[PDB]
Design a protein that fits this description.
- This is Alpha-conotoxin AuIB.
- It comes from Conus aulicus (Princely cone).
- It is found in: Secreted.
- Belongs to the conotoxin A superfamily.
- By secondary structure, the protein is mainly α.
- It is globular and about 15 Å long.
- The chain contains 1 helix and no strands.
């Protein structure tokens, strides 16, 4: 889960 995990939300343009 990229959009619910804080560091993967901050790095990826879609989230």
């Amino acid at each position: 889960g990229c959009c619910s995990y804080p560091p993967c939300f901050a790095t990826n343009p879609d989230c």
